[PDB]
């Protein structure tokens, strides 16, 4: 195993700072979250995720669904993380606009959007080849945290939940489903979950809320929904609040056929 590698030495402290949880235990709620995302437990390979998923949201990258931009897709997060990324490299004024350049990408950011003018081939090679690289993964985390994760851990903070189980599963959730906005999201779950300042309680409750609306084909391929909501709860239930020393228990939780 040995969660750290997966990371960057940065990545893991910046992750520490931030959200109180070690490489084992983002390890193990990437993990939970790569199942039914990707169907694959080795999420690493994920960082140099890269794919027209005709869409119309030009290429999702990496491992929480940036896309570059497109039609359907006009405030895409992609070019944040490229900008982060140039940040990462040590750029004085970061942009998408200088990442595309460092990696010699034919593309340019046009509104919010990147505009994209070499081939899939071309453009998704280069992504792949960023897998193992230290700035790239450290971009990746940054751009997530700014994304999702920040607001899950202050969800949590505020309610005084800091477990590894009550994260993951928020950050799965806002990341399935939108961190804020309709009563879908995690924001409109969590005003429907009651106030029990009982943590175990809390996320019974909160999982019993999300399995109404996940599996709405638009968040997931019923049953699949049912079942990403149902790795979470059982750790609940079997008290591995934690996520540390939980590998067997992981392979037997996501021990599921997605469809």
């Known amino acids: 195993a040995s969660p750290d590698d997966n990371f960057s030495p940065e990545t893991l402290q910046f992750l520490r700072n931030n959200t109180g949880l070690d490489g084992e235990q983002w390890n193990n709620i990437m993990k939970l979250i790569n199942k ?40 895409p997060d992609g070019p944040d993380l490229f900008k982060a990324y140039d940040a990462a490299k040590g750029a004085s004024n970061p942009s998408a606009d200088g990442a595309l350049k460092r990696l010699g990408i034919n ?12 081939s899939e081939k071309v453009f998704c090679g280069k992504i792949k080849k960023l897998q193992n690289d230290a700035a790239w993964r450290k971009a990746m985390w940054e751009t997530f945290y700014n994304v999702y994760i920040r607001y899950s851990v202050e969800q949590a903070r505020q309610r005084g939940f800091t477990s590894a189980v009550t994260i993951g599963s928020f950050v799965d959730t806002a990341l399935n489903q939108g961190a804020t906005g309709g009563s879908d999201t995690l924001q409109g779950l969590l005003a429907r979950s009651g106030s029990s300042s ?26 699949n929904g049912k079942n990403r909501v149902k790795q979470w709860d059982t750790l609940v239930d079997m008290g591995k609040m934690n996520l540390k020393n939980v590998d067997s228990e992981i392979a037997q939780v996501t021990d599921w056929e997605m469809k």
């Open 36 to 75: 039914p995302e990707q169907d694959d437990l080795n999420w690493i390979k994920y960082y140099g995720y890269c794919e027209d998923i005709e869409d119309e949201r030009g290429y999702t990258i990496g491992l929480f669904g940036a896309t570059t931009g497109g039609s359907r897709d006009t405030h």
């Open 107 to 118: 593309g340019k950011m046009k509104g919010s959007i990147l505009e994209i003018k070499d």
């Open 198 to 223: 009982n943590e175990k309680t809390f996320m019974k409750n909160f999982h019993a809320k999300r399995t109404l609306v996940v599996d709405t084909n638009k968040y997931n391929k019923p049953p």
